[model samples]
Target: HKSEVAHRFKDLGEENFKALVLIAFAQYLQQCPFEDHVKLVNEVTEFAKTCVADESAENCDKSLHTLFGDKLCTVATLRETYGEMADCCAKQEPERNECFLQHKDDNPNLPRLVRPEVDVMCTAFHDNEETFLKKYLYEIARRHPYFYAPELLFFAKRYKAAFTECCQAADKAACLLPKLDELRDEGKASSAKQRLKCASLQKFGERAFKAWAVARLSQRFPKAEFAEVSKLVTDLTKVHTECCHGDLLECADDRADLAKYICENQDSISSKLKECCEKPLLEKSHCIAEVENDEMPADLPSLAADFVESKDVCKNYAEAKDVFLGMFLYEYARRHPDYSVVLLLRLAKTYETTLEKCCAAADPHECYAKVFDEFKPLVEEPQNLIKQNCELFEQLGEYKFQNALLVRYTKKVPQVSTPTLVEVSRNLGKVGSKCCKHPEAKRMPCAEDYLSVVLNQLCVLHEKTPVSDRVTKCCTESLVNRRPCFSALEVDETYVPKEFNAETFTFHADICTLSEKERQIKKQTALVELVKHKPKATKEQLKAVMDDFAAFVEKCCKADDKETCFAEEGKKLVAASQAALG
Candidate 1:
């Protein structure tokens, strides 16, 4: 191992040799006391020079032994859990730091470090400032072994600054208590964020996690080159690889470094993302996460042919399905940033499930070749419906537009009551109302997802209830086809409501006697009642009669003989209704 370490560094040349040594020292410095930092730096520099002068196993071992003798805790840790720092020298220059980090054992069962009471700390600080400060730095350093050396220094710096300010003040407890809480809160927040990231990484599986990352990174860095975004993704995913394995402190350190990298290269990000990157460290990630995705670059390639057209999909799938699909998703996602995360995820899931079915089948290639062709309509039709719905929603006002939807659905599925149809239509209208206004890139997905949900509610509501065979066919259609099915549904002309009463359409003088709001409500209710009675009414027919009735209300409501005027006009209205019903 010693010879291998010497051999590893001998060919790295002077610059990489020194750099690698400093990185190794950073690992040691994570646990070193603050006072020992400068001295360790001097010793580390000397060791690097010694190795540069004489690249031999003996020289390297001697230098490391001398350094480790004073910092025995670091020695024990490196020798035991970290597998000795010398082994990390085997890696190439670019990966050596990560190699060192990767070697550190999680130490999950390690005892927690307790913070002393404010009075005890103040007393200790007063008794021997130097010893207390050294002890304080040492305690913090050991407690967060995964922190980078500079982070430990930053913590020690803050603690000392707080102690000096608070301990010298009149109200030490008041000054110090909040200070300690602030630091503790910062640490807890960091942990919580890491926990959420790890949960996403582990619970969702890596491919899904990468899919989410691709979606977010594409959103945050719209102007960045694809290669640049890919590199950033690789770096960010390193946190998941570490954190999901229970190395949260290392995850935190890497996450902070990633945020710094993103901010440092803010020129490539969106205007909103740049603004977010300008925030303080703790606030930065959340802000970036919330920033809306930008429009997809129009010139992206049309396909990711490797996964889509691969002849041996099952073979590739068997080897590393997540990676294969993840790369496919990454490639596909960047090219189609207009696609929602939900859509991209569904596509990926479909591809995966198809592969699962095919790989276990008699002919994988044949199954694979047909999977997408079979799947195309499922994606295209719903997306088309979304586009058309948004267009209609934008052209027509929310209330009438989706209410027309309810009117149509009622005509098609007459077994469902007017109230139920009203609920479904109004629900779909609410979806279209909000989703239609989203930016072009987001609009389809927003509408597609929520509209699907509302339609799903419609399906589920009447799924168990007895209805005609054709209505049952639509309600029982697969989720992806259900919306399109209902969109193309025709009225079941053979069906009729047994409860319909022609007398309900009688013109009562009471409607004219009602208040303005009540009168409008009564007329609207009468119109919907008309739809319920005439289940075969065309949208054009419904609108025509609605217009005629509204016009009559406008004219006859102002007439002196209101009752006589309504009664006379009511005949024409009934004739119009009969004409619409036919």
Candidate 2:
């Protein structure tokens, strides 16, 4: 046994063997071979001896377990990280015992799951000739929770790579990856009484899961995930994209906070992972990719205008703040492309000044409390950009306009809600300044640059009768005027975008709705009624004329171009209608 140990130690390289002996068995050493570093190694060995061994430690006590399951706690590791797991334990005995109890398996310094880098990669296992046409958007969404909705729908149709669809990126990492880096600045919390363990990474993850449900990896198989089915899986995803990035309370109790949260709230709407564990994707190939044409347009801007908060200029407004800061101001700004810097400054000042009246100069959070008090009139929702946008219009003239846009965007993009566009909008501004600054020659930047954060920041685009067409429903339903409001804003009824025309700036969906089949049928029926004159036209005459026009329209009236085509054929139809006058 001595010979075997000697051979193993000899093979471990001279320095490592010396370091190991100095740590694992320094208690037996009397005459130290290396006199220079003897005291440091002695301290390490003493620390190692202090470990309270629990040979039957729980491997899956998620309270302390990272995405990676617990490993057998070693004397060496405890010595190295006696500080890592037991922060104040060194200062006191009770603290050490408490620390030992709380973090029996936590290795914050080591937060890796089985294989983090590989699990999130959708490219390495490629089975396509047309790859770049659509990037592994799931990866993008994995990092940017803001992109989760589009990316979710995008992947659902492309390869059904919905986060809630599986555990490919494990629930914790999926939600935690995107926001964690954003919240921590080189691992520093904005203002903490005490720094969290692992640079607050584990706490960051805890907060991330609390703020949003990045994905749902609820169900799994020994080999793979189970397939989603109707009886097994319900429609509405119970996950909350609105999960506050990190509940301070959640951040406070480091031990098993996320594990406790998920385990306790398993079936609630709060859990994005709510349904994941309930249903599994049994047959991988059973579902076909539903994405029709995966080609994302080349000209779409990457950095959407980052709307500056009308308030909080002191904190965010930098002398080095990007100019595009006011460009992608909000939904209002996105709707209006030619917004001036002055307009954004005015909006920010309105909130900031009001907040100042109610709050001291120091407490930014309280300033927000006052702003919330004065902001909304009827829409008492969360204090998000959506509400702020509504207020932006309300304080001006078109609260309906902003509300209309919000109503539409929320319904259409299921994964997105107020909680995220809040960050996405900000991240877009930060990313856009960098991403969208380029000219026509180079590839434009976006939040997910070339589907990676490499270029700009996040921005997605769309049109016509595809996935994002619900804009038509938005425009028609929300407005009090029941007509295109931008038209009323034209000629400076003092609406957005100086010199912008109503016909040009109006919601295209509203304009396009003129071509709807239901509307088209209504127009044909109304035109017939113009001749009917409350039943003045004889039934026989009406029948003959209606039959001919109906047949012509059936074959000729394009569902997509009802307005122009109807006008072109209007003379013949009217002449017939005159003959069959009501």
Candidate 3:
């Protein structure tokens, strides 16, 4: 009946057809006076004919239908009265709301006319109650289903109730049960059967439940929900089981065993899952591949090659390769400054060995240095790396010197002074002692050899002396200072003659005074003695002692016997000394 009404109105060029149908139907149903209905229908018909003549009738008709469906028609009317009552209600609403009320009271059976069909339509559309209410009164009547026809009404009510329950369930397992079953059946029927064949119907249900639990847990616990965060762990376990134990239903025994394990360490499992889920997708995949492949690379720096072959390289590459490479390169460079290039090349080779080795074991510093070196000369920025290497070398040298000092002193190296200075002093003592043990002290350089290098470099502008003269002077000084030398000569007899001509002595003294080497040796010996014996000597007092010793050495070397030399140069010194006292 509703379809018949809709079809009749549709042929009348839409607008006028709807209007006329509503008027006539209202009059037939006794909702309005027959005369007024006729008059209104005529008026609407005239307007519709005019629109049709203007070639705009189609658009006008569509507009009327849209407005009628959206605003006027109920689900019942759309299912029964259709367009007939729609036009009538549109015409009489507000002015005659009681008109339809009176008609419904008069013809109760008419309200129940299309209830069954309306219920079927509503159920088909998933209990779209708003659409039903807007379109037809028949839909309202069918809400109880008692007035509906038999065949279409049976499962309709059940489906409608089920749909309502589903909506209420939202993100719960119950909501997804039907969908999960459907998907499982569909998966079984698909072309990619082998891959999905292992995923049982029960597994589908389990997966759905897991997914629901994940969402619910996340919503409730959020930050604390480890399993929800660790989807990688969950997914990997699922895939592994499916692939490995395909078609195996989890029995009660299996569940019991799992429960035992899970119950014993639920918190740990949850924490692990959360950690796994937090990892990036690629990271998770790589980790999974590592377990699946069962082979981890030994060299992380070379793990890049492994990564190219398979993702297993990523699992422990950082721990295996990257950390080791950085440490190795740093230590190697420190130990062997001359072999930096070799170290870098070795590191690079190690890096290319495997993906794990490359990323994990490759020294970042060597890699950076290598790249920097390659580009530096081209870009005119070659100074930085070289400077850095020089600084590293200096630090290494200092470290070695300090280590040596610690060994010699049997104490921690002092931080305040240069360890090199301490090392040089220690070496001087060693060489001097060695000379004392030598049979031919005059022939060998002994301690003098070490002093000669320093003295020669310092006195480069002075005229060159024979090696024998240098050795002789050094031995004589050692004897004069009581430095435990093998030289048999006594200082008083050898140079400090008790009885000598004033001129010869003065000439000999002048020679010694002019020699900066002799003066320096005397001052150094005095400073060493002061430092060794009187550790409490103030730095200033020690410096003063050194200055006096230097002055004394200069005066003695220039003395003629001890009289003329002392009188000439020593007089000037004595006068300056008297001035200071005054």
Q: How many residue pairs of model 3 clash at the backbone?
A: 50
Q: What lDDT score is found at residue 410 in candidate 2?
A: 33
lDDT string, candidate 2, 407-502, tens digits: 333332433324333333333333333433443222121222221221111111222222322333333332112122211221112112213122
Q: Which of candidates 2 and 3 reaches a greater lDDT?
A: 3
lDDT of each: 0.62, 0.30, 0.35
Best by lDDT: 1
Per residue, candidate 1 scores C-alpha lDDT tens digits across 1-582 of: 443234434544443333333334444445433455545545655655665556672457543433333343334344444455546655544355555556554333335767878888999988898667655555544554544333444455577789999988898988998898788755544544444456556655665566667655765455676667668778878866874553333554577777777777766755556677767554455465557666556666545256657676678778987666765666666666566555666677788888888789897777777666755765576577677887888788876686567666666776766666666666677778777777766766566545545554555556767556665788665433455566787767677654556576766677767875476445545656777677666678778887887788767878888878788888778876786667
Runs of candidate 3 with Cα error greater than 4 angstroms are 1-323, 327-423, 426-519, 563-582
Model 3, global lDDT: 0.35
Instruction: Indicate the TM-score of model 3.
Output: 0.17
In model 1, which regions exceed 4 Å deviation? 1-272, 279-286, 294-302, 309-312, 357-376, 390-400, 430-442, 449-495, 502-524, 539-544, 575-582
**Which residue segments of model 2 deviate by more than 4 Å?**
1-261, 264-353, 360-373, 378-582
Q: Name the better of 1 and 2 by TM-score.
A: 1
